[PDB]
Amino acid sequence: SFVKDFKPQALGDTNLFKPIKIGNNELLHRAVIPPLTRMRALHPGNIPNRDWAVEYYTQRAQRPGTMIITEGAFISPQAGGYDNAPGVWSEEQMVEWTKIFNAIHEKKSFVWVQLVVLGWAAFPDNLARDGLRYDSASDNVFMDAEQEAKAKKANNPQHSLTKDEIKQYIKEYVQAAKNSIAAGADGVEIHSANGYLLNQFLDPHSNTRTDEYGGSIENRARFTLEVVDALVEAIGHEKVGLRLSPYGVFNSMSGGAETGIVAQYAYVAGELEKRAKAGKRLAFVHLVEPRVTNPFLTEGEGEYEGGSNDFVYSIWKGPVIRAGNFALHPEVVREEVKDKRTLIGYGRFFISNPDLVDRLEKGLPLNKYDRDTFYQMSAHGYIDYPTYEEALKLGWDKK
Amino acid sequence: SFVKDFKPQALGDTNLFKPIKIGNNELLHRAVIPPLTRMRALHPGNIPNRDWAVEYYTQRAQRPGTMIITEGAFISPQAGGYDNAPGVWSEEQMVEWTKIFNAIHEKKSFVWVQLVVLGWAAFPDNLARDGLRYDSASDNVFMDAEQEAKAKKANNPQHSLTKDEIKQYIKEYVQAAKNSIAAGADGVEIHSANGYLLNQFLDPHSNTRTDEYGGSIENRARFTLEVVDALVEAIGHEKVGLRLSPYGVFNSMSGGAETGIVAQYAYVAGELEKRAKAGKRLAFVHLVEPRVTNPFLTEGEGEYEGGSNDFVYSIWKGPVIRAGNFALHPEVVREEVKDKRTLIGYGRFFISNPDLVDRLEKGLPLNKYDRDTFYQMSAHGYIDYPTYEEALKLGWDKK
Ligand SMILES: Cc1cc2nc3c(=O)[nH]c(=O)nc-3n(C[C@H](O)[C@H](O)[C@H](O)COP(=O)(O)O)c2cc1C
Ligand SMILES: Cc1cc2nc3c(=O)[nH]c(=O)nc-3n(C[C@H](O)[C@H](O)[C@H](O)COP(=O)(O)O)c2cc1C
Ligand SMILES: C=C(C)c1ccc(C)c(O)c1
Ligand SMILES: C=C(C)c1ccc(C)c(O)c1
Ligand SMILES: [Cl-]
Ligand SMILES: [Cl-]
Ligand SMILES: [Cl-]
Ligand SMILES: [Cl-]
Ligand SMILES: [Mg+2]
Ligand SMILES: [Mg+2]
Ligand SMILES: [Mg+2]
Numbered sequence: 111s112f113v114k115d116f117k118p119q120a121l122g123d124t125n126l127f128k129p130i131k132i133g134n135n136e137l138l139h140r141a142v143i144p145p146l147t148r149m150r151a152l153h154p155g156n157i158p159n160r161d162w163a164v165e166y167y168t169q170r171a172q173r174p175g176t177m178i179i180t181e182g183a184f185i186s187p188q189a190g191g192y193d194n195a196p197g198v199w200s201e202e203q204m205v206e207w208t209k210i211f212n213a214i215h216e217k218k219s220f221v222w223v224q225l226v227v228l229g230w231a232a233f234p235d236n237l238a239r240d241g242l243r244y245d246s247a248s249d250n251v252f253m254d255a256e257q258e259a260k261a262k263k264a265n266n267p268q269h270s271l272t273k274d275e276i277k278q279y280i281k282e283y284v285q286a287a288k289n290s291i292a293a294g295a296d297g298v299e300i301h302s303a304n305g306y307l308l309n310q311f312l313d314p315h316s317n318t319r320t321d322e323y324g325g326s327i328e329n330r331a332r333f334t335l336e337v338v339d340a341l342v343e344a345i346g347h348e349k350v351g352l353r354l355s356p357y358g359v360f361n362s363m364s365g366g367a368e369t370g371i372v373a374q375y376a377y378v379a380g381e382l383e384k385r386a387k388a389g390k391r392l393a394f395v396h397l398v399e400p401r402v403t404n405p406f407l408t409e410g411e412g413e414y415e416g417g418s419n420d421f422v423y424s425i426w427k428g429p430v431i432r433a434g435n436f437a438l439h440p441e442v443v444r445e446e447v448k449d450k451r452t453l454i455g456y457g458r459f460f461i462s463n464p465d466l467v468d469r470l471e472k473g474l475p476l477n478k479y480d481r482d483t484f485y486q487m488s489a490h491g492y493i494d495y496p497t498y499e500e501a502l503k504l505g506w507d508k509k
Numbered sequence: 510s511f512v513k514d515f516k517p518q519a520l521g522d523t524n525l526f527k528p529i530k531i532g533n534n535e536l537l538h539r540a541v542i543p544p545l546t547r548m549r550a551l552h553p554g555n556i557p558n559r560d561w562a563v564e565y566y567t568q569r570a571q572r573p574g575t576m577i578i579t580e581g582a583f584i585s586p587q588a589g590g591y592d593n594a595p596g597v598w599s600e601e602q603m604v605e606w607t608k609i610f611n612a613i614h615e616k617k618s619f620v621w622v623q624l625v626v627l628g629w630a631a632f633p634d635n636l637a638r639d640g641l642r643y644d645s646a647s648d649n650v651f652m653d654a655e656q657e658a659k660a661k662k663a664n665n666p667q668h669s670l671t672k673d674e675i676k677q678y679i680k681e682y683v684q685a686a687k688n689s690i691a692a693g694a695d696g697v698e699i700h701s702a703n704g705y706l707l708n709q710f711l712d713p714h715s716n717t718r719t720d721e722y723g724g725s726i727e728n729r730a731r732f733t734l735e736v737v738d739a740l741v742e743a744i745g746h747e748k749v750g751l752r753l754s755p756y757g758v759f760n761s762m763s764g765g766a767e768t769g770i771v772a773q774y775a776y777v778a779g780e781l782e783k784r785a786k787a788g789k790r791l792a793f794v795h796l797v798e799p800r801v802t803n804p805f806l807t808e809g810e811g812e813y814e815g816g817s818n819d820f821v822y823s824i825w826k827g828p829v830i831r832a833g834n835f836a837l838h839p840e841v842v843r844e845e846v847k848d849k850r851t852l853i854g855y856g857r858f859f860i861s862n863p864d865l866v867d868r869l870e871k872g873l874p875l876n877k878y879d880r881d882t883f884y885q886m887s888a889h890g891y892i893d894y895p896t897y898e899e900a901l902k903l904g905w906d907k908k
């Protein structure tokens with residue numbers, strides 16, 4: 111069915127429908143597919159789904175000139191810990207990714223691989239089964255009691271990374287980025303958001319280190335910036351973006367309760383701008399808005415009203431993608447896209463609307479999403495959401 | 510004469526005319542007199558002007574419930590270096606300040622002493638004459654070539670403060686604050702803006718130190734925060750405010766060209782909010798806007814459009830005074846005061862309009878200021894600017 115109480119607005123008369131260049135890619139509109147984990151990859155080997163993933167991405171690439179950021183992809187076995195999320199370290203994985211990228215490109219759209227390291231969000235028992243550590247910034251603060259207990263039960267207590275192990279992750283980011291580009295991707299996004307490993311280093315709650323990787327703003331940002339620099343060197347700044355969620359609380363990050371949080375993220379933005387002014391400007395910065403501090407809460411819940419991401423625009427002067435509860439709020443989008451370097455990521459409603467871009471242009475009703483199939487091993491709730499035309503044929507205008 | 514091309518707007522229907530409590534003081538409106546050095550103090554001894562200062566402040570206190578921040582006042586001889594700016598270290602000074610404070614209070618208005626240490630902005634030859642150092646954060650970067658040369662010619666080269674000398678300034682801030690309160694002031698403002706000593710520590714251009722007072726965001730903020738903490742302890746948080754100018758370039762500060770500048774100031778704001786949440790909230794934060802990066806340039810010049818002070822509001826949750834080119838822009842004030850904890854400082858047009866508050870309420874023409882008498886040893890351009898009534902009697906409506 112369509113979302114019942116929603117009053118759509120046509121956004122075709124706004125900058126959402128003006129072309130913009132992101133990295134090497136000439137986008138034809140500014141509605142971006144943010145990274146969306148869907149848990150259809152198959153075990154063993156974290157293989158992108160051989161039956162359905164091509165169709166899923168093909169459907170969502172249908173509007174020419176769309177920027178798609180993939181579901182998060184693990185850079186190595188040690189970076190993972192969810193059996194049904196994909197990786198980008200192995201030949202078999204890349205066989206499937208190549209098909210996905212080719213399909214997106216045949217639709218005249220673009221694809222950026224999000225590179226993920228889970229840290230304390232991983233399942234410690236999966237990691238123990240596979241002979242892998244359970245990693246984070248620190249060893250004395252935990253995501254939650256259940257994770258701590260699971261790690262102990264698995265004889266795999268949370269481990270604070272050594273400098274050597276940080277370097278090994280950096281090597282894996284580099285190789286994952288190379289693999290992604292060689293397989294045909296347009297670029298990569300470094301996931302430094304939503305409470306995963308890099309965010310665990312950024313945040314003073316999760317990072318109690320006293321070496322060069324913690325204990326100050328510069329130190330907490332060090333790992334993120336080393337990854338940025340390593341990827342810029344390996345594949346070029348025009349092929350690299352960075353995702354941040356300053357106000358996020360998902361995965362036990364601090365959000366606005368931490369009075370130093372804006373400074374921490376302002377420092378990162380400033381360091382990116384310094385690199386840009388020195389000739390190496392990242393393709394984009396992607397921000398999760400305080401509109402959505404936890405993306406598993408229904409739209410309108412978990413909204414933080416005590417902060418804005420606007421500060422980033424005073425500092426970073428390149429493209430900015432903003433995501434969080436924008437599908438149901440075209441009136442907010444209309445205002446934000448008056449800024450000529452702002453793009454809008456639409457997550458949950460791109461899950462349910464393969465033709466979302468047309469719907470945004472034309473002010474059409476939106477398909478309701480089914481949260482129960484966000485993570486499910488099924489084509490249902492993955493590739494069977496209808497286009498607007500298909501929904502009319504199903505009678506959804508009368509449901 | 511009145512400003513010729515100005516189209517006034519009555520602001521009586523805005524929050525500019527709603528009462529607000531700042532520290533211990535119940536303000537009746539939100540038009541603040543920011544600190545304005547006028548150079549009428551007499552030498553020797555940096556004595557507030559015995560003939561005219563009471564009248565100057567009495568005139569500008571005329572609207573009941575006005576918050577006045579004094580001209581900058583030196584905390585000690587070593588903190589000074591301009592012969593005609595006042596101090597707050599000596600009995601003779603305080604005799605004159607007591608008369609000023611009493612006069613302001615008789616008009617049912619309030620007075621906060623701005624506490625100043627000049628650093629590299631001081632005149633090194635005046636300091637040498639008096640047996641005093643020429644101080645800054647560093648010894649290898651200078652305000653400008655003329656200052657560097659004057660210091661060398663005076664056998665008083667710029668000196669990088671020792672930790673002991675920083676502590677001595679802190680002792681002087683404490684005693685100056687005590688003196689101010691004992692003489693009847695309502696509070697003090699710590700000047701950490703406009704390129705004076707504390708700002709010289711905040712800014713990475715002027716602060717090349719490698720000890721605990723430089724080399725990182727936390728370290729550059731250390732001296733400012735030590736002064737805050739010392740004054741809060743001495744006289745109470747309700748009697749202390751802090752002035753900052755994130756985007757200022759006056760006195761050779763970096764402004765927005767420094768990509769880390771927002772982070773530096775976000776850190777300070779965050780540390781103030783942390784103290785507030787722990788029970789010691791400063792009375793206010795006073796910000797100079799990027800509207801005026803140098804207050805000796807005509808309104809509209811030196812405007813930085815690449816940044817906003819709005820970030821501070823995501824971090825610090827108390828009152829905020831904003832200053833910079835607001836008198837000529839009631840349309841901007843009307844928007845900013847929609848925020849219910851925002852006050853507006855009016856500098857140059859309070860020099861020329863003793864009854865500015867009435868003029869703002871009622872949308873009256875403004876007296877043009879005379880920059881040539883901003884710093885002059887004269888009653889002219891100090892105490893002889895007319896009220897609106899007086900200006901009408903002079904025929905200024907027909908000039
Ligand atoms: C099912 C689901 C999976 C997600 N997976 C990822 C991910 O792999 N990487 C990521 O950075 N964010 C991920 N997110 C967060 C989204 O990219 C997005 O920031 C969030 O859903 C807010 O946007 P929305 O309100 O448009 O959905 C996910 C969100 C959902 C609901
Ligand atoms: C003559 C003059 C003297 C000033 N003296 C001081 C001072 O003692 N302390 C201070 O913090 N700012 C001082 N300022 C800066 C003002 O407080 C204010 O921030 C600036 O003039 C911008 O506001 P305006 O456009 O309303 O004048 C001075 C400015 C002027 C023009
Ligand atoms: C890579 C995965 C599993 C993922 C899931 C959800 C979110 C919000 C995310 O950032 C990442
Ligand atoms: C204390 C003095 C001399 C002063 C003068 C001008 C400005 C802008 C300031 O901040 C301070
Ligand atoms: Cl619904
Ligand atoms: Cl799993
Ligand atoms: Cl004029
Ligand atoms: Cl002088
Ligand atoms: Mg251990
Ligand atoms: Mg906005
Ligand atoms: Mg169902």
Ligand SMILES: [Mg+2]
Pocket residue numbers: 648666667668
């Ligand atoms: Mg020397």
Ligand SMILES: [Mg+2]
Pocket residue numbers: 844845
């Ligand atoms: Mg504003």
Ligand SMILES: [Mg+2]
Pocket residue numbers: 879881
């Ligand atoms: Mg003259």
Ligand code: NA
Pocket residue numbers: 118119120121472473
């Ligand atoms: Na419409």
Ligand code: NA
Pocket residue numbers: 161489
């Ligand atoms: Na099938």
Ligand code: NA
Pocket residue numbers: 420423424816817
């Ligand atoms: Na802005």
Ligand code: NA
Pocket residue numbers: 485
């Ligand atoms: Na789950």
Ligand code: NA
Pocket residue numbers: none
């Ligand atoms: Na269905």
Ligand code: NA
Pocket residue numbers: 517518519520871872
């Ligand atoms: Na009017």
Ligand code: NA
Pocket residue numbers: 560888
């Ligand atoms: Na006289």
Ligand code: NA
Pocket residue numbers: 417418819822823
């Ligand atoms: Na705000």
Ligand code: NA
Pocket residue numbers: 884
């Ligand atoms: Na002068």
Ligand code: NA
Pocket residue numbers: none
């Ligand atoms: Na005159």
